[model samples]
Target chain A: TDTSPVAAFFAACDADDLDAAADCFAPDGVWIVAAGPEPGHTYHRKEIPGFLAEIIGKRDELDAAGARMVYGDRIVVADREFLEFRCESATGEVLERGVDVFTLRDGKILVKDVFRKAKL
Target chain B: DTSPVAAFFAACDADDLDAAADCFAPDGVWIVAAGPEPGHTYHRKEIPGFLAEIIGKRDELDAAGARMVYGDRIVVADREFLEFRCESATGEVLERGVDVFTLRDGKILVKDVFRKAKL
Candidate 1:
């Protein structure tokens, strides 16, 4: 459970393996943001594909600008977070970010509670 | 820096390696909280030891809790953010909650940041 999603998601993102990241999501599942203006918000399963497309669009920009994540020591009970990609995509200008927490079931992502850096 | 004071303090408090958390002037340093009286306010240094003391005031509260840090990947910034919404445009109480952060360092005390979010 812990090894699969938490470890793999960032490994894939760093490897630029889009399919792997997509595979992390559940089919009839949802992603939730833990904190923000729209707190307790969940982007549905169907909307994820489009969301991912936008995410990929900004990957190169982040890589070029050295936008990154901090993979340090592990947290108390859970695995160390595995992502740090700050994006400002031109595709509808949907800026996305987070300090996200994930929970896995079987081999798919059951829940993702994200905490984004507030947009000022 | 990470290994210095952070790990030990929590280890001490958590029974990871030590007896008590290390020295991290908790209430003395500026610790921000939420609620009616809020904003970059600290409990005062004198209060931090007591705060840490209260934290130790537990061995097993119903369930045993320990210090936690996430590696799922976080940004490498100042390890000093209690409020994720301390951005300038946040005049609205966008969200409010408690951030029970556990930190350890090389010293005589460990520190828990009771960071709260407020408008």
Candidate 2:
């Protein structure tokens, strides 16, 4: 049965395994920063590991500080995947509200395009 | 019959206001976030007037060299999300956004729009 590989990545992120999450992407894949000050900047697969590490590291910081990061349902549309999520401080101050869209090729992620509602 | 979403947008791209207006459910709603603000909602009853407004401005927008494009549709159940953008003829982007739509019987029930806004 065909299944979602992005789910595996989200599971790894839930477990706080940055390496495992990055492994979900193809070597030539890219992560496009769709918004913010450096919008359109791309991180290729070669740089994805460190980039994910930094992201997970920041998540860990907030996590350890008892902040909450929660994801909504996984929605697969055509060859893309959608996930809505929010990050909030311990006191419930919203940090970010965002959506991540993933494009897959041959069962591996080819691109991750992100759009967020506010500055992080 | 196929998804009406494509045809609906095609009408929009072709600037066929009547065709575009025919694409919605009788009681549908169009929800929009114009920028940093959200909660902008319009009903199907308002669609004709709404499209008329856009049609009224079409020539001016085209004159000002505006290019609006949409694609990258992701369909899940009865809902779909697509990427959309408005740009200048000089290749300068005015907006980059996404619209989530709910469909029923080849007619749209809702269109929820979100865009990156400068705050």
Candidate 3:
């Protein structure tokens, strides 16, 4: 039973449970996306559900490609956690890779920042 | 007591290229997220000279009143992550990024940089 907030958040995301995912955030939490509708935009906690819903809605594309998201290295230092994840096909080919940094406050996520490897 | 990671950043902040270069292991590598490659790699031996180039621009950066500000930092065991932002004197952000470091015996083995700035 992994009880880490980051793990819980990802589990909710994997289950496509937007509300559950949002529940992992603090009341004043923020999610900063490096590449979003507005680059480097900071989304407030209240907007998390809609933001996550948009991403969850895109899961069909991964399913169509026979790909799923998989997590790799995870580093936890006190209230901060860094997770490496990748979208991989059934053939084991990596489709995309990124890193997420989470800052936890009172066992809830205070901030979630994302960074992805882009094509040259 | 200053940690190796702290020393590294302090050296960079002071523009002491030699001290900054010394913080890395003999085979240390620096990877920049944006460039011709998804991550351009620079070896330890090449770091000092590379940093010198950045230090050379300090005059312009100072003129713009742009200062590097380190934000959230997490250091545990052999790994560390640091968030940094460069802001102008007027409080406008010029750049934001994170650096993930792998340490070996108090020396930096790898410093991977991911910046919001696109190539």
Candidate 4:
């Protein structure tokens, strides 16, 4: 609510409100995790819950200083918005820099594509 | 092309460095996984060679039946982002990537790239 819907999704997720964060996606929305040269895996709204839980669970372990999320640059085109940021381990070590391509409809995110570069 | 950016990509495919670089601001920044720890940020003058390094490899890749394809473009205000991939004729993906751009007055100010895995 304080930030744009696209920004809020990450804010909520990093804040530990996974369900509230997942609500940002359309019920049938898709989230593409860029894993390799292919388009990567697509997760529908139904799959967002588990994805959020998994990410949050991992962050809890790796983020020793509660500084796991750091946002970078962003781009918005009509229904889509591209947000940039990074993930870090609490000890000031960088993990990866990420860019999220978000497709929004009616103020809710309909699709999300994640891209990242490794810091290690 | 339907958009200014589309034309830029076409220039890239056509290997028209001048036309492609025209889309960027003279002081534009291009970030990539080429150098530095996290990555390297380049300037307009250094872009042609950087782009060359990628597109120049296309001829060999295409001969091997693999070519780069870009899609899933998203724009916001003066910024934009798109999906990039290198795939085989049979649709086998060899690499996946993304480009995020910042623009002003229709010219690119920053082009940030990211790959799913280390190259």
Q: Which ranges in model 3 have alpha carbons more than 4 Å from their true place?
A: A36-39, A66-70, A88-96, B117-119
lDDT of 3 at B48: 84
Q: Rank the candidates by TM-score, best first.
A: 3, 4, 2, 1
Overall lDDT per candidate, in order of appearance: 0.44, 0.75, 0.80, 0.75
User: All candidates' TM-scores?
Assistant: 0.47, 0.71, 0.84, 0.75
Clashing pairs in 2: none
Over A1-120, each residue of candidate 3 has an lDDT whose tens digit, in order, gives 368878888788778777888999999999988765334778998888888887776777777869988886668887788887778789976676667888899989999988765656
Kindly list the per-residue Cα lDDT of model 2 for residues B1-119, writing each as its tens digit.
Answer: 36667778788879887888788888888866542322356887788788878676766777899977877676778888888777789877677767777899878998766655543
Assess the local accuracy of residue B4 in candidate 1 as a C-alpha lDDT between 0 and 100: 31
* lDDT for each residue of candidate 4 in A1-120, tens digit (9 for 90 to 100): 456677778778768888879888877788888663344678888988998888777777766657667776555566777677777666766666777778788878888877776544
Q: DockQ score of candidate 1?
A: 0.07
| Residue-by-residue lDDT tens digits, candidate 1, B1-119 | 45333443465556543233234433224333322222233444444454465455444331333323322223233232222322213343333322324333322222222322222
DockQ per candidate, 2 decimals: 0.07, 0.21, 0.30, 0.39
Give a tens-digit lDDT track for model 3, residues B13-62. Answer: 88787899999999999877665445578997789888888787766898
In terms of TM-score, which candidate is strongest? 3
lDDT of 4 at A92: 66
Q: Highest lDDT: which candidate?
A: 3
Tens digits of per-residue lDDT, candidate 4, B17-89, equal: 7788787877887888434446678888898887778777887899999978888676656767778888888
Which prediction has more favorable lDDT, 1 or 3? 3
lDDT of 3 at A117: 57
Better of 2 and 3 by lDDT: 3
Error of 3 at B24 (Å): 1.8
Docking quality band of candidate 4, CAPRI definitions: acceptable
